[PDB]
């Protein structure tokens, strides 16, 4: 949680573009900061970007190969649509280890997201009957 990381997280949250771009540029050359830092509330850059729905920021982050984790599930849970399209074509969990993307999508009615997942091809287990 160095001051450069705090400044960079604030830049991502507010929505400044040039600042985050040059920060990702100058981060690699020196290794003085980490792009995968964690907020005191457990919110890396990708999570907050997804929450605010900044598609350009999201793509920029993706291009520089940031760790994904349950970002797909986080985007599904918050009904963001285009982010799902971006996130498909590419150990403190939050959801129980028994949730697959189609299941969590079905939990929250969303015709678009469900129709997008189904075409890729998934299946849901049929539990044993008693």
């Amino acid at each position: 949680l160095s001051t450069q990381e705090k400044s960079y997280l604030s830049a991502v949250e507010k929505g400044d573009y040039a600042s985050v771009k040059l920060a990702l540029e100058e981060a690699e050359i020196y290794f003085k900061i980490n792009i995968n830092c964690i907020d005191p509330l457990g919110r890396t850059a990708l999570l907050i970007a997804i929450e605010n729905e900044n598609l350009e920021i999201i793509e920029l982050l993706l291009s520089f190969n940031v760790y994904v984790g349950d970002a797909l599930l986080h985007a599904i849970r918050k009904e963001v649509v285009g982010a799902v399209e971006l996130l498909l074509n590419h150990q403190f969990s939050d959801f129980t280890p028994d949730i697959t993307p189609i299941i969590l999508a079905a939990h929250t009615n969303n015709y678009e997201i469900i129709k997008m997942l189904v075409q890729k091809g998934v299946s849901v287990p049929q539990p044993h009957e008693v």
Partner: protein, 77 residues
């Protein structure tokens, strides 16, 4: 009621009535850490978003636009 029929206290109907404690705190400590993490994440961070809007929000949202307008207009002259 149920808990009364667990220990080996009476075990008999009426008519016939004639390392270990220093170490185990470690696992429970770990479990508390994990549980508090889960709770604080999923109860007072994601339930503080579905509340509602009042005028305290509208005023800020309006004044931000006004300030942006002043900045742009003044900077162009």
């Amino acid at each position: 009621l149920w808990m009364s029929y667990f220990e080996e206290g009476g075990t008999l109907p009426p008519p016939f009535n004639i390392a270990e404690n220093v170490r185990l705190n470690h696992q429970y400590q770990e479990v508390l850490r994990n549980l508090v993490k889960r709770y604080v994440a999923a109860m007072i961070r994601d339930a503080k978003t579905e509340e509602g809007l009042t005028e305290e929000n509208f005023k800020e949202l309006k004044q931000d636009i006004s300030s942006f307008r002043y900045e742009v207009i003044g900077m162009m002259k």
